[PDB]
Design a protein around this ligand. Structure first.
Ligand SMILES: N#Cc1ccnc2[nH]c(-c3ccc(N4CCNCC4)cc3)cc12
Length: 272
């Protein structure tokens, strides 16, 4: 409803729709207002009571309590579109633009960011939600608190233990078993994409541009990267899904030890 919110600038637009900066007028809470056209939504969930975008289903499942997931505050239906009201940190920067600006990240900052992503994805998985499009574009930095927040569930699914045969996320982040066989399981495809994400943070760019590089799965480092970080990246990018580490094995890996707290991260690395 437009009496409830005051619309500000367009923050961005893409396959997720159009996202505007906004202010809830009853208390001047900062929000992000996202518009998605009905005809451009492919997978529809439905809530326990009416037919909705799958994205709202998944967001409600993960929006209870605190976490590093942008939380859904409200939504509205319009004749041709859905409108989502999402929280907005201030100041905030997409991790993609952040990497564009700074290049390859110091391993200390990548570790903290990567740790927070793992914690956020784990939370999603405990709520029964598979994101399916983990990448730097879908991660926001709360610059003051040094906290990362996951966004854009419009390609996700309910988590399940059987095989997925559909995928509509980012291809250069998708695993080799999707490219060759159009089949994957939720968590090991998620680990693969986290492998891509970690590489992207410590090298400033994704390791694979084409299907054959994905399928060959050979990782070449164009920046200096510690042997432990290299070993973790290659473990997540194991060609056989069952050779990939569990979430727990990632967080017990030697490269993941002694993480900074998020406010520490901001004070040291984000000028807080
Ligand atoms: N604040 C906030 C917020 C809350 C929920 N979803 C978002 N997407 C975005 C967002 C999405 C995309 C972009 N960009 C702008 C830079 N080019 C890539 C697309 C910038 C911001 C922000 C938010």
């Amino acid at each position: 409803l437009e009496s409830q919110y005051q619309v500000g600038p367009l923050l961005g637009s893409g396959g997720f729709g159009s996202v505007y900066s906004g202010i809830r007028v009853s208390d001047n809470l900062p929000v992000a207002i996202k518009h998605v056209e009905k005809d451009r939504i492919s997978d529809w969930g439905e809530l326990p009571n009416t037919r909705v975008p799958m994205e709202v289903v998944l967001l409600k499942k993960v929006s209870s309590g605190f976490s590093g997931v942008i939380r859904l505050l409200d939504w509205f239906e319009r004749p041709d579109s859905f409108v989502l009201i999402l929280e907005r940190p201030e100041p905030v920067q997409d991790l993609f633009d952040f990497i564009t600006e700074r290049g390859a990240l110091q391993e200390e900052l990548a570790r903290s960011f990567f740790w927070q992503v793992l914690e956020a994805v784990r939370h999603c998985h405990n709520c029964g939600v598979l994101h399916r499009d983990i990448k730097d574009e879908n991660i926001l930095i709360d610059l003051n608190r040094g906290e990362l927040k996951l966004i854009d569930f419009g390609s996700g699914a309910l988590l399940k233990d059987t095989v997925y045969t559909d995928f509509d996320g980012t291809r250069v982040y998708s695993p080799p078993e999707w490219i060759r066989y159009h089949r994957y399981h939720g968590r090991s495809a998620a680990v693969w994409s986290l492998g891509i994400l970690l590489y992207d943070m410590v090298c400033g760019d994704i390791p694979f541009e084409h299907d054959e590089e994905i399928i060959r799965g050979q990782v070449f480092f164009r920046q200096r990267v510690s042997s432990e970080c290299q070993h973790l990246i290659r473990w997540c990018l194991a060609l056989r899904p069952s050779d990939r580490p569990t979430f727990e094995e990632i967080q017990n890996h030697p490269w993941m030890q002694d993480v900074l707290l998020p406010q520490e991260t901001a004070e040291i690395h984000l000028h807080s």
